[PDB]
Amino acid sequence: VTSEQLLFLEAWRAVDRAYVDKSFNGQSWFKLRETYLKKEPMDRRAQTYDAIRKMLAVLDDPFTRFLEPSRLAALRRGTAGSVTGVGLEITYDGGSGKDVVVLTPAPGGPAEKAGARAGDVIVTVDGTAVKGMSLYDVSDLLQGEADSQVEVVLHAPGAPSNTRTLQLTRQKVTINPVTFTTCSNVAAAALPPGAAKQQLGYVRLATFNSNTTAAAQQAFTELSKQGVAGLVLDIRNNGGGLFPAGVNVARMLVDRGDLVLIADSQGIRDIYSADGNSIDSATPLVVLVNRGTASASEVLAGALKDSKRGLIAGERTFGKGLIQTVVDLSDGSGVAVTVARYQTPAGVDINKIGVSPDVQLDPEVLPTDLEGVCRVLGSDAAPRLF
């Protein structure tokens, strides 16, 4: 058994131990290992990496991927300094043809400013066809030094002929996780039943990151103090992000009860529940979501819905409910492995199914800027949120 073979075995073991489906897509995992050791060339590092990728592929899970040393390091630094993108979060088509699509455009980032919307399908990046490539590889094509440009060709969902070519300039993108306001003189259409004041509290939660919790706490607190008639939590176009901040937010609204189950082929592995630290669990709440709402955001929405704490309004969410971990290998390379999936308190998978609105509404009727929101909600054309 060679050094190259041991390295391969490290990758095989990472999956053997942690993979979400212990039936391995119907493959005999140990048998594969023995077969590859015997039939696959692993004379140089490069061959070993290819053999690892080949093995991962049999799982038919495009999120389970191998990362070479430099890539893993870069993944780690992420979009921090010197490394910039164009304000796109990407993922694979929801019916996955290996089509890469825009999960969500970052608010005010380059791609959004150039008209890109959640659900658009990415055809090429700098001429390269992205269908079926690793998302880690695709991001690499999308990223680069600030002020540099990249060409992205996109089409409308289910309209391959409806394309556009954008020349985007890479720039740092800064999403402010939370903004909020009180809307006064709200239209009757937009109020919850039995409202005693025509005022609504609006909270735009654009991303879950390190700053989300502290900012959301301040918003709910203030709003509660104002005695608003209803709360409008806006998580449209929020790709998820920091799972714990989504849990923290859920905990601000619900006093008791399960929030999310973590499951895999074995059954439920972990649960997160309310911790009695609510800020506001009584004001009527409506949560706005759309096809750009994904992952931690969907989890939030699903806990609010199942618990009956809030109504979901808008359009069905993405259905991005898998969880991956990156397992480091001895040579600095790594494997991103799907280890689990999110389920609602009711035990339904978020994956694929997403979270459906109780109130179907055109997801573009309401703006996301504080001024515009109050304007529309005070209008004769206010959405019937509740």
Side-chain angles (χ1 to χ4, degrees):
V1 79
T2 63
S3 299
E4 302 296 320
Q5 278 165 336
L6 294 167
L7 184 58
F8 168 82
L9 279 184
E10 291 178 50
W12 172 97
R13 203 141 40 233
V15 174
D16 194 64
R17 281 172 172 172
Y19 199 60
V20 66
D21 168 17
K22 298 309 195 70
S23 88
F24 300 96
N25 196 207
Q27 298 294 311
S28 300
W29 204 243
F30 205 87
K31 315 286 163 67
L32 178 139
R33 147 185 178 152
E34 293 297 286
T35 293
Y36 274 51
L37 282 173
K38 267 56 86 181
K39 308 278 81 224
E40 295 296 329
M42 291 181 212
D43 297 332
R44 309 159 246 136
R45 189 47 55 67
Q47 285 182 308
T48 310
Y49 288 173
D50 294 340
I52 285 161
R53 288 186 279 262
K54 184 198 191 149
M55 158 183 69
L56 302 178
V58 312
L59 299 167
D60 280 356
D61 165 19
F63 294 108
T64 290
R65 295 285 184 165
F66 175 74
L67 296 137
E68 282 186 30
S70 69
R71 296 299 85 224
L72 172 62
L75 166 80
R76 298 234 136 117
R77 308 159 213 111
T79 18
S82 136
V83 182
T84 63
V86 300
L88 287 169
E89 194 149 352
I90 61 185
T91 198
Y92 290 108
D93 199 67
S96 197
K98 294 201 76 213
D99 268 295
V100 164
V101 309
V102 176
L103 196 216
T104 194
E112 187 184 57
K113 287 194 305 213
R117 289 179 160 98
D120 284 343
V121 176
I122 298 183
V123 189
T124 54
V125 177
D126 274 323
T128 303
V130 300
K131 189 178 183 151
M133 286 178 44
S134 172
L135 306 179
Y136 298 95
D137 285 333
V138 184
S139 318
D140 276 321
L141 286 167
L142 287 166
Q143 297 166 352
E145 290 288 58
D147 301 319
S148 65
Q149 289 201 308
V150 59
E151 178 194 274
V152 185
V153 172
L154 312 75
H155 77 253
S161 67
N162 181 24
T163 56
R164 286 294 176 175
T165 304
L166 310 179
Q167 307 290 337
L168 310 168
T169 302
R170 305 180 165 115
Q171 275 178 329
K172 186 182 168 191
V173 171
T174 312
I175 302 160
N176 171 70
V178 180
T179 60
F180 71 105
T181 193
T182 300
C183 310
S184 281
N185 303 128
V186 174
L191 293 161
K197 219 154 141 161
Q198 299 149 285
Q199 226 164 51
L200 288 181
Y202 169 81
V203 177
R204 166 64 174 147
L205 219 168
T207 184
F208 292 91
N209 59 200
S210 64
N211 285 331
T212 302
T213 294
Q217 177 187 160
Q218 212 251 304
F220 289 124
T221 289
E222 268 324 295
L223 293 179
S224 179
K225 291 187 191 169
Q226 293 180 39
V228 305
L231 282 163
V232 177
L233 175 65
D234 184 8
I235 57 178
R236 284 171 297 160
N237 276 18
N238 176 342
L242 219 202
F243 169 74
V247 174
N248 293 343
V249 175
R251 285 178 173 157
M252 291 177 191
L253 305 159
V254 170
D255 299 296
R256 292 290 173 288
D258 295 326
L259 307 167
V260 44
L261 318 183
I262 305 302
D264 62 16
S265 63
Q266 184 173 303
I268 302 175
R269 307 315 304 276
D270 204 354
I271 181 178
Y272 286 81
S273 298
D275 65 353
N277 283 308
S278 73
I279 281 172
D280 195 337
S281 41
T283 312
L285 169 69
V286 60
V287 185
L288 320 184
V289 308
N290 68 347
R291 76 184 68 201
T293 298
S295 205
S297 305
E298 283 188 275
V299 163
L300 174 61
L304 291 180
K305 186 179 178 155
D306 286 13
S307 74
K308 303 266 35 208
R309 168 66 178 104
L311 280 176
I312 305 299
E315 67 170 11
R316 176 190 155 188
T317 65
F318 198 92
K320 183 172 188 59
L322 302 176
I323 293 165
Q324 285 78 36
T325 304
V326 172
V327 179
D328 296 342
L329 309 191
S330 54
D331 64 353
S333 53
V335 185
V337 189
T338 298
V339 302
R341 70 207 131 79
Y342 294 120
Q343 297 192 327
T344 63
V348 176
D349 271 58
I350 289 306
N351 199 240
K352 302 325 207 197
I353 288 158
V355 171
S356 295
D358 280 294
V359 190
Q360 263 268 138
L361 289 178
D362 170 356
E364 287 174 326
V365 158
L366 200 79
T368 39
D369 63 288
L370 302 189
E371 179 190 355
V373 163
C374 295
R375 175 189 81 238
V376 176
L377 290 168
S379 82
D380 197 301
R384 288 205 124 76
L385 293 180
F386 293 79

